[PDB]
Amino acid sequence: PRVSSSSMPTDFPLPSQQKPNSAVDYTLTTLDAVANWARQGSFWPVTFGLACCAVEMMHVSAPRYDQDRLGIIFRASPRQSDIMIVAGTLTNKMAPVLRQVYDQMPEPRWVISMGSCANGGGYYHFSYSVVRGCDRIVPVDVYVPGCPPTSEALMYGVFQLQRKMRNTKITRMWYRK
Amino acid sequence: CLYEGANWFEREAYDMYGVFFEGHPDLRRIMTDYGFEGHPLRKDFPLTGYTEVRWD
Amino acid sequence: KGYSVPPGETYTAIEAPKGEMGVYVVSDGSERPYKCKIRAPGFAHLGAFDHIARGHFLPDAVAIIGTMDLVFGEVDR
Amino acid sequence: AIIATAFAETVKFSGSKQELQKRTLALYRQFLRGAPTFADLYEVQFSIPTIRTKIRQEFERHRFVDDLSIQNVLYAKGHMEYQECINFWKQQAQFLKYFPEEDDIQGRHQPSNFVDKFLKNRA
Amino acid sequence: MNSFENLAQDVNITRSGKTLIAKGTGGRSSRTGYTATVFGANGFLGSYLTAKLAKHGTTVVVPYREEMAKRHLKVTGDLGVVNFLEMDLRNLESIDEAVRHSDIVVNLIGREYETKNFNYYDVHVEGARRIAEAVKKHNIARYIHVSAFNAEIDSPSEFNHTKGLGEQVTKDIVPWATIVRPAPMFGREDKWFLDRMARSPCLVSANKFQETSNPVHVIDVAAALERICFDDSTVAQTFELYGPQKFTQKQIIDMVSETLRKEVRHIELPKALYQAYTKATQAIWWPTYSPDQVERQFLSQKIDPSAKTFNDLDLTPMELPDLMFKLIRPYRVN
Amino acid sequence: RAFTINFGPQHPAAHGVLRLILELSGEEIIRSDPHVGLLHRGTEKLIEYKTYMQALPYFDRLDYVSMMTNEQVFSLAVEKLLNVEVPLRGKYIRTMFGEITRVLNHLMSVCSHAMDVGALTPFLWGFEEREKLMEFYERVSGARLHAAYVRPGGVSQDLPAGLLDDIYMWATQFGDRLDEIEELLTDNRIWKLRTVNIGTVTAQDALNLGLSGPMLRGSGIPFDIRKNAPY
Amino acid sequence: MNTFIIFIILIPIVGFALLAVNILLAVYKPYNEKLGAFECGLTSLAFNAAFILVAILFLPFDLEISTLLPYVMSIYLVSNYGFTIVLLFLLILIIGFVYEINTNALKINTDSLIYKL
Amino acid sequence: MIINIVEILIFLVCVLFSVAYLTVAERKTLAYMQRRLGPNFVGYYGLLQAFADAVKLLLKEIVLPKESNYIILVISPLITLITALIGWVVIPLGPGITLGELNLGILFSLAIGSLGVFGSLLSGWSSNSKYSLLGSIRSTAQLISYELILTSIFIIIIMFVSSLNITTIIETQRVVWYCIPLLPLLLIFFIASVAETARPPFDLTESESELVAGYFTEYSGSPFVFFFLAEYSNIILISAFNGYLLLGGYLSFNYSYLFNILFNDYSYVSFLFEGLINSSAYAIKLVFLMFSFIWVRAAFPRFTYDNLINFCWIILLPLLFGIFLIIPSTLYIFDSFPTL
Amino acid sequence: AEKRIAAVLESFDKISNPAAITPTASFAKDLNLDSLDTVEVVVAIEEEFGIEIPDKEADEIKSVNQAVEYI
Numbered sequence A: 001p002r003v004s005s006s007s008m009p010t011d012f013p014l015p016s017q018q019k020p021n022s023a024v025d026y027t028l029t030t031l032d033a034v035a036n037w038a039r040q041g042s043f044w045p046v047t048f049g050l051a052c053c054a055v056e057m058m059h060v061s062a063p064r065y066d067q068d069r070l071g072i073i074f075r076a077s078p079r080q081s082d083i084m085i086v087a088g089t090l091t092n093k094m095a096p097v098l099r100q101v102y103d104q105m106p107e108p109r110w111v112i113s114m115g116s117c118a119n120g121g122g123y124y125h126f127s128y129s130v131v132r133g134c135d136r137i138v139p140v141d142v143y144v145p146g147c148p149p150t151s152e153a154l155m156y157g158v159f160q161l162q163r164k165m166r167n168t169k170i171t172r173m174w175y176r177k
Numbered sequence B: 001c002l003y004e005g006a007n008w009f010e011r012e013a014y015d016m017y018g019v020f021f022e023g024h025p026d027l028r029r030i031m032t033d034y035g036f037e038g039h040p041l042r043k044d045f046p047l048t049g050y051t052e053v054r055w056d
Numbered sequence C: 001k002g003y004s005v006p007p008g009e010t011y012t013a014i015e016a017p018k019g020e021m022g023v024y025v026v027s028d029g030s031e032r033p034y035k036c037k038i039r040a041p042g043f044a045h046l047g048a049f050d051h052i053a054r055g056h057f058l059p060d061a062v063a064i065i066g067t068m069d070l071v072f073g074e075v076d077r
Numbered sequence D: 001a002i003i004a005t006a007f008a009e010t011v012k013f014s015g016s017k018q019e020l021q022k023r024t025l026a027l028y029r030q031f032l033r034g035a036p037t038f039a040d041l042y043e044v045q046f047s048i049p050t051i052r053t054k055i056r057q058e059f060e061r062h063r064f065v066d067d068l069s070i071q072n073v074l075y076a077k078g079h080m081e082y083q084e085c086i087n088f089w090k091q092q093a094q095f096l097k098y099f100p101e102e103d104d105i106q107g108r109h110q111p112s113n114f115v116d117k118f119l120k121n122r123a
Numbered sequence E: 001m002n003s004f005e006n007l008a009q010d011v012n013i014t015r016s017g018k019t020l021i022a023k024g025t026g027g028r029s030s031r032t033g034y035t036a037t038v039f040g041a042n043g044f045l046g047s048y049l050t051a052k053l054a055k056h057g058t059t060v061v062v063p064y065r066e067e068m069a070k071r072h073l074k075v076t077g078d079l080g081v082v083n084f085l086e087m088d089l090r091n092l093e094s095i096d097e098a099v100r101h102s103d104i105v106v107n108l109i110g111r112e113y114e115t116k117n118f119n120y121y122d123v124h125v126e127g128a129r130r131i132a133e134a135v136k137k138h139n140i141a142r143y144i145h146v147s148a149f150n151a152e153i154d155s156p157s158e159f160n161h162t163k164g165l166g167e168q169v170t171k172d173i174v175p176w177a178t179i180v181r182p183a184p185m186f187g188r189e190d191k192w193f194l195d196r197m198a199r200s201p202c203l204v205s206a207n208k209f210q211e212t213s214n215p216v217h218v219i220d221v222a223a224a225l226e227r228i229c230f231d232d233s234t235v236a237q238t239f240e241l242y243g244p245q246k247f248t249q250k251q252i253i254d255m256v257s258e259t260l261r262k263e264v265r266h267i268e269l270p271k272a273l274y275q276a277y278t279k280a281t282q283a284i285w286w287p288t289y290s291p292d293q294v295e296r297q298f299l300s301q302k303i304d305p306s307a308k309t310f311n312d313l314d315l316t317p318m319e320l321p322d323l324m325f326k327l328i329r330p331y332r333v334n
Numbered sequence F: 001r002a003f004t005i006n007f008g009p010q011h012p013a014a015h016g017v018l019r020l021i022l023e024l025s026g027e028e029i030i031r032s033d034p035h036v037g038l039l040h041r042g043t044e045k046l047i048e049y050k051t052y053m054q055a056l057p058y059f060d061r062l063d064y065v066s067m068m069t070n071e072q073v074f075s076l077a078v079e080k081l082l083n084v085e086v087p088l089r090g091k092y093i094r095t096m097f098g099e100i101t102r103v104l105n106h107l108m109s110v111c112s113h114a115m116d117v118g119a120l121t122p123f124l125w126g127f128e129e130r131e132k133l134m135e136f137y138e139r140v141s142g143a144r145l146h147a148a149y150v151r152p153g154g155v156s157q158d159l160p161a162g163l164l165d166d167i168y169m170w171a172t173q174f175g176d177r178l179d180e181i182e183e184l185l186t187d188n189r190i191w192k193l194r195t196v197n198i199g200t201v202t203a204q205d206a207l208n209l210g211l212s213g214p215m216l217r218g219s220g221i222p223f224d225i226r227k228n229a230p231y
Numbered sequence G: 001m002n003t004f005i006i007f008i009i010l011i012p013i014v015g016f017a018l019l020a021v022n023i024l025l026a027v028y029k030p031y032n033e034k035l036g037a038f039e040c041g042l043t044s045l046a047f048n049a050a051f052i053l054v055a056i057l058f059l060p061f062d063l064e065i066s067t068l069l070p071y072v073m074s075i076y077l078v079s080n081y082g083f084t085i086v087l088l089f090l091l092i093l094i095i096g097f098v099y100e101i102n103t104n105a106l107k108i109n110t111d112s113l114i115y116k117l
Numbered sequence H: 001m002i003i004n005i006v007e008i009l010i011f012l013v014c015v016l017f018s019v020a021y022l023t024v025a026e027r028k029t030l031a032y033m034q035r036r037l038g039p040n041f042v043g044y045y046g047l048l049q050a051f052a053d054a055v056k057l058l059l060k061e062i063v064l065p066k067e068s069n070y071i072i073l074v075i076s077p078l079i080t081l082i083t084a085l086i087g088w089v090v091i092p093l094g095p096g097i098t099l100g101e102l103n104l105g106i107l108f109s110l111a112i113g114s115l116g117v118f119g120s121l122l123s124g125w126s127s128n129s130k131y132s133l134l135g136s137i138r139s140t141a142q143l144i145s146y147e148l149i150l151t152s153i154f155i156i157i158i159m160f161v162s163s164l165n166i167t168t169i170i171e172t173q174r175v176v177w178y179c180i181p182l183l184p185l186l187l188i189f190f191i192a193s194v195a196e197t198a199r200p201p202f203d204l205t206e207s208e209s210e211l212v213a214g215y216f217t218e219y220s221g222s223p224f225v226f227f228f229l230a231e232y233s234n235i236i237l238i239s240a241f242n243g244y245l246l247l248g249g250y251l252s253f254n255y256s257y258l259f260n261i262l263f264n265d266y267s268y269v270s271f272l273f274e275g276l277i278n279s280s281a282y283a284i285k286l287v288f289l290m291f292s293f294i295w296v297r298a299a300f301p302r303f304t305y306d307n308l309i310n311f312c313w314i315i316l317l318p319l320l321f322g323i324f325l326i327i328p329s330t331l332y333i334f335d336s337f338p339t340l
Numbered sequence I: 001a002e003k004r005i006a007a008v009l010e011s012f013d014k015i016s017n018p019a020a021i022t023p024t025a026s027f028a029k030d031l032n033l034d035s036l037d038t039v040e041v042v043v044a045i046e047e048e049f050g051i052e053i054p055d056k057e058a059d060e061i062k063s064v065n066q067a068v069e070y071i
């Protein structure tokens, strides 16, 4: 049929270098700012604690660091959670269960891999029943190194995840479509 | 039949090595994955096993 | 290389906070142990769970697990 | 006490081959009977006849083993497997290990003679 | 031990003079030596193709638009196998960066509706032209261009018209490209097919659900694409990937109802009324049935007489009746 | 006909790795089948490929709240094989830190227990004391949890210069910190409703089942390796 | 159209509005693994009489309690007469409550070891 | 019409925001009882925390499990929220100062309360997760059992007033609050309001440790928002029932002398000042009650199902029937049957 | 009714004579069915009719006539 030529530009900036220069761009920036602000302000993980890393994960919630003061509530059901924290050695016996709990989280969902064991198989990397890193099983957004990561390192990893949320384009991305 | 506590230890010995315990009421794997082939603590079993898993 | 341990074997147990913890190490005269089995008190406790918890209610099973004080690094090594 | 679980059989090494074949055929019958239960539990794509075919192949593999002790061990392991399947202890991932053929074609090149094996350094 | 099922041999020579030596048995930690750019990799077919490519450790460069949509692709390859590149069709340098280092370029970029920024022409002809210009300028060894079945220049449908024009411009720019035309693809979480039939409030047809096409499994299309990627004898050929047997839309809906133990609601409407409805709903921001989709609801599949098929790739498509239960299992209710 | 439920793995009381298959006739547990090995790592297979010095950290990570007592059991085994003697100061340090480790482990066990029954506050109060002691761990060994401090032959490093005073300063107030938990728990009638005559074990069955520690001393038998086999 | 009826109408509208906002803004990507029911992470009925009995005995006791509404709304008008009548009513019901208590209706190895020498 | 609209918006906004901030107040108070801080980062001093959680949950996908009745699963939280909010239409903040001035106000409160077990009864059937079913049956049992105690205390109070208008019940308490002659009845209403709301120690209904999460295991997004909102709104509303049955509602002290000093005639200033005094009295009573809910949550371990059923049906209910006998007896002895 | 037995038994491999199913035909003697084959046909029968058959008598079935006397 009818449309036979194109006028699309040739140097349209990529999202990572795009700045909001128009009324609709500022509107969408504000809406994205609200949504990302909510996502960082209500940071709900699923606890999925497996080994010695779960102890530093509890000490995050202890009085001295008080994850709750930032808006972090650990919620038992995966249905009510945003973030999965893989804190511990992932065995071959546990891999299907982990993938199942990851699948049952509603979108949007993020995963943080805490500890050497979850990052790369760690001190049991050459064992016959250990998955050499949870990113064989679920996609991972932030890797927290340590064995076990101190509570401050885990909180720093949380801040990194929130920084990633804060730079996410939601409606601006739709506008680019 | 003599010591109740020996139940789990004998299931572990079988799982790790393959040693059978005659008269054990419920002898099955206790540690290894379901459907694991091989008895890991045998000197001829390689360190890293023969198989690994991933998401397909 | 490491120090070489005289050949032999030993079972040595201590009063760990969770009960009796012991190790059965087999030495072959070399720098690497020939065999090391750890006796974890949680293993025996969780074994006794089915005898202890029969005839109780589900919340009582929760309380029982609490009093056994299991860590599960001990249970499976 | 710690009581046995569902479909648990105490370990007993048969002193005679015939008394072992009785148990072996019983176990085979149990597996054939449980096939539909396995098909429901593990949400398999394939058919119940294929489950039963797989079971028959598994039992076939040791049809010529002679020494009695090895037969005893094989029977004990077969029963342990049956108890594992029927109690839903196993998951779908480990269950489908038994079934490598029903997955799709892995690729265009599965070498059969020396030249194709040699080209892939597998000769 | 694993095996490089996609490779015929160990040492390979690209058309561009690169020597590729596969290392390893063929598993996750192995490397085929090939590098491939998959445009539209985060889509329905791109995901399967990327999984098959990175399974054997060929480096996959994935140009993406939204960061959160591509995350599942990282799981499919070892460390450093799956690489992500920010890309946009209106940024030429971005396309150049995506194709620069590859031995294989396949593009699956196609959209079944129009947007405020990309109409059918902008997404199918100028987009393909830019990708093919990057390919020709960098002299990429293999370029695979996926179009749709029934792609004809003078079609009634803007989709098929722009698809045919895209094929023509691709052939003009890169004479050695391979053109694939798959039939309607089904499979897990497909688009405007089985999953729509399984959870729609009502399926509304303007042509009595009479249209015929040979539906093909998405896994099979991806496997055929992989085979085309790794054999150099498919250069400058056209492929018509389609399923074994011909179905009518009503037949598929009847099969879905029988497998679902639930009756699928069908309502037949006049073509003008359904056009106006679709044109109206095109005003919301989430994808919805197109006007041109209902225009295509009057076109039955037409298979080119002279076109290579699944047989030339030594492949046998699976049957849609066989997968039904596997493909729609979560809605049976029972 | 029994009803079968999968208690755990994803369950706070289960501690994340306890797939506890129970069979219920209504409310009552008829048979229980704990399934383990979700955390089987192959520690014992891996130790055979490690020097003794290299194999020591495998024990920190066994009971990952009682690190130094684990290091201590392995050290006593290896020293008994080696026929060597730990110096006096080293022995005293290992005793002090064995009891700091006991205090940490009991804080975790008691507070996790009370959190399982529903008493959420002792969790936090006792976790502040845990933080205070993990300061001492970090000061002598450099790691909060997995110290790798107690080694066959003694301890890796001598104590830092200002540690005894700080331990004593903490010890002057731990007594009150205990009294407060006891105020919430010891006499509360709901606590006694959840704990009295629950999980009863006889002396003879305690011995028969292989139980040790508090699980055995609760049944009336005075057995304590610290008093019986003075180490 | 007083405040009462308008408020009563307004509340469900607010509920429906929040629901519609959720439906409009949230993504919706169902797939088989997500649709599975959650039981601690992996796929997988007799009851006791007291379960039945709490529910069933709720209804008579509820009726007893709600039978005193006419009394407390007419206490003065019925004077010392109605007073006595409602005492008798209450005692008759208390008898049934005693029966319930004594029958233990809602509630849900000690042998010696003898050797034949 | 306009005035009606403005009154309803003012009241509705105050109630919704009070529920929203009760969650933050709970987190902060528990935090300080646990030597920690609680939310102090999302908004100044953590004052926007509740709206942050809200917005997030409204942007969350809704998951409808395969075996579930999706209509019931989505509508059950909606009806429980509606009834929880409808219950507020009769609560007065001053003499006659309410959205609904019903002569059957008490009966309305009890009825809309009795409509509160349907969320629990329906979600277990809707979720189909087994944990949800066990939680649902046990909850339905517990809630109806303690609703009996609440209704019985309602009746005992009406024995003193002989009216089902809430304002009248409050006005009769200028002489004395009913929590003075009936202190034991006030203790039981708290113990039962805790249980009827399903709060700790009596949180058996949705206890994470016995059953992961609870009946809500499967509720994501706005349905979870609805259960959450209904639960905290019901907390405040049953604290309101306690307030006007036993704590004298909006009565604080006799400010007649003070007003005669300050003012010399009726004016909008004086009407506003009186309104603020009454509302402040009633709101401070509500605040003490909500604080007590949070306090009890901080202090005690949970009950078991058997324990709480035994409590309600063997310790509380006999005492309440005994009081049924002893209150009219005391009225008869002293010739003080209340008039209509 | 026995014809249903014959139908179930007929549709099995390893036999090249469908008509050889006489009402008293032994599997191991006529049909040349294996031990495993015998268990297979027994389970096929008991499944077709839906009846569960205990271990002992199920072992003691060896022929079609025995199937019908127990059917």
Ligand SMILES: NC(=O)C1=CN([C@@H]2O[C@H](COP(=O)(O)OP(=O)(O)OC[C@H]3O[C@@H](n4cnc5c(N)ncnc54)[C@H](OP(=O)(O)O)[C@@H]3O)[C@@H](O)[C@H]2O)C=CC1
Pocket: E039, E040, E041, E042, E043, E044, E045, E046, E064, E065, E066, E069, E088, E089, E107, E108, E109, E110, E111, E118, E123, E146, E147, E148, E149, E182, E183, E184, E185, E191
């Ligand atoms: N599915 C079918 O039934 C048939 C499909 N086809 C063709 O198959 C190919 C893919 O099928 P499918 O995977 O189902 O399509 P999908 O929509 O699932 O994926 C298509 C890809 O196109 C990308 N895309 C679309 N427009 C643009 C754009 N303007 N700029 C950048 N990227 C863009 C999308 O990326 P984003 O996610 O960023 O939008 C998406 O990755 C398409 O070419 C389609 O025409 C042909 C015949 C049948």
Ligand code: SF4
Pocket: A051, A052, A053, A054, A087, A088, A089, A114, A115, A116, A117, A118, A122, A123, A146, A147, A148, A149, F061
């Ligand atoms: S990474 Fe280290 S500390 Fe963390 S779970 Fe693994 S072994 Fe324990």
